[PDB]
Design a protein around this ligand. Structure first.
Ligand SMILES: N[C@@H](CCC(=O)N[C@@H](CSc1ccc([N+](=O)[O-])cc1[N+](=O)[O-])C(=O)NCC(=O)O)C(=O)O
Ligand SMILES: N[C@@H](CCC(=O)N[C@@H](CSc1ccc([N+](=O)[O-])cc1[N+](=O)[O-])C(=O)NCC(=O)O)C(=O)O
Ligand SMILES: N[C@@H](CCC(=O)N[C@@H](CSc1ccc([N+](=O)[O-])cc1[N+](=O)[O-])C(=O)NCC(=O)O)C(=O)O
Ligand SMILES: N[C@@H](CCC(=O)N[C@@H](CSc1ccc([N+](=O)[O-])cc1[N+](=O)[O-])C(=O)NCC(=O)O)C(=O)O
Ligand SMILES: [Cl-]
Ligand SMILES: [Cl-]
Lengths: 222, 221
């Protein structure tokens, strides 16, 4: 609304979560308009935005092609998008199959295991009132542990599920690229070779590079 | 496989996450056996369990009614059970509907918002190598914020989605009951009246009380 795209995607430019959804929209050739919700100015707690998400966090999605259907939680947004619109199953497992729920498994690992613990690392590095080395260390270690989990699997198979790149793989990309800068003496390709190759393979895709490049642009300027 | 139940449910007794799955299994008349994986002995990091879940955390599920299908992540386990076995849709939204994805939304809020932040509150209270009041406060405030979000919604509608109790609602129960007993001088019913009523309504269900009673038994002297 105010644009002619199928989706409105409300996100904060610095966040991992909205760009993840952008990746998936790009893969599926779905038109979207990015609507910036600036967490730095507390806009995610604006009453207008909280009408979209009572949690008052980015991102959120409106599907103008489905009666302006509103949905939040980035993982749920991805799932909605892929399930409804990836009917050829280019990048997703078919709903109502075993593999679908393995796909779901990995997305919950992303959303509950990668996101929150990566996020606490950033928090205690950048944002917490006190600088607390033991807290920074905690979530550094946990980030590395997450990498080791991915490596455990990816060293033995190309993709997380179904023998192809899916929304399961894609979901990890944004956070994994962001977290590198927050780890000391860290050589991603050296420490986790299979995970690194997997990561940088996806990031090379124009469908993923484009949105990520736009994040970069948006962030270069205040 | 040593028992004749449809499901092996691997959980740690003290964790919120396994019992959640139990709730759903009970609701859906599905037979299961609980297999305790003892985090106190680091059993979740054993080679045997890590074959089930490379993440090396509880819980995990084996569906012996589906060729010993193995799945982990408690929210994914719930969705699998419900989607496959709630054919009359007693407590779940139909796959391939808008409401399914609102249902999924709320489960992700549970899994990514309630769980991890509640967990960090417990961690910095009990387990961290040093006491850090600013860290405890952070996650104590976040916990209350989660309650606030539920209250914002549940004070204006009975259930989270679809006008009935679903796995969306059920998913919150175990962590909520743990945190409200965890927190000192906290009057749940006073502080968040709609959420409290919604909470205790579910906990009164025999299908939910049964597993929760078993947890309390296991947790006790
Ligand atoms: N004050 C708010 C955050 C305000 C803020 O500055 N937000 C950041 C995003 S947080 C953030 C900041 C840096 C990185 N990072 O890639 O290193 C990741 C995240 N993040 O969202 O997890 C932002 O808008 N930056 C815009 C810009 O850079 O121009 C808080 O305390 O959480
Ligand atoms: N589980 C949700 C998580 C959404 C989320 O984390 N949203 C953040 C994005 S911004 C963000 C996300 C991560 C981090 N970080 O520090 O890791 C910093 C920032 N930030 O803008 O300051 C947000 O709105 N936070 C503001 C708030 O909670 O009030 C999802 O996947 O959609
Ligand atoms: N070595 C492990 C210890 C694991 C452990 O012993 N489990 C805890 C439960 S963790 C826990 C403790 C308190 C609360 N709580 O909400 O009060 C929630 C959780 N939890 O598992 O989420 C426990 O009390 N069991 C041993 C016993 O009962 O003898 C660690 O440090 O994390
Ligand atoms: N997202 C996953 C979360 C799984 C999870 O948290 N598992 C815990 C359960 S025990 C647990 C869960 C929460 C808390 N807590 O402190 O809140 C304490 C304990 N504990 O046993 O010490 C675990 O295995 N932890 C051990 C590990 O990571 O190595 C899911 O929903 O399945
Ligand atoms: Cl976002
Ligand atoms: Cl568990």
């Amino acid at each position: 609304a105010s644009h002619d795209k199928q989706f409105s995607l409300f996100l904060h430019k610095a966040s991992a979560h909205g760009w993840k959804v952008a990746f998936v929209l790009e893969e599926l050739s779905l038109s979207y308009e990015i609507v910036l919700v600036d967490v730095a100015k507390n806009e995610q707690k604006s009453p207008e935005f909280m009408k979209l998400n009572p949690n008052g966090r980015t991102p959120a999605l409106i599907d103008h092609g489905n009666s302006d259907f509103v949905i939040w939680e980035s993982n749920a947004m991805v799932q909605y998008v892929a399930d409804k619109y990836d009917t050829e199953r280019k990048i997703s497992m078919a709903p109502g199959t075993d593999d679908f729920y393995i796909q779901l498994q990995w997305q919950y690992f992303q959303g509950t295991g990668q996101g929150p613990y990566f996020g606490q690392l950033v928090w205690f590095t950048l944002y917490h009132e006190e600088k607390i080395p033991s807290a920074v260390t905690r979530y550094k270690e946990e980030a590395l542990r997450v990498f080791s989990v991915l490596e455990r699997v990816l060293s033995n198979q190309e993709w997380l599920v179904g023998g192809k790149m899916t929304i399961a793989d894609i979901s990890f990309v944004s956070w994994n690229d962001m977290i590198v800068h927050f780890l000391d003496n860290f050589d991603f390709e050296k420490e986790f070779p299979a995970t690194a190759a997997w990561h940088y393979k996806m990031l090379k895709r124009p469908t993923i590079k484009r949105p990520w490049d736009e994040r970069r642009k948006l962030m270069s300027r205040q």
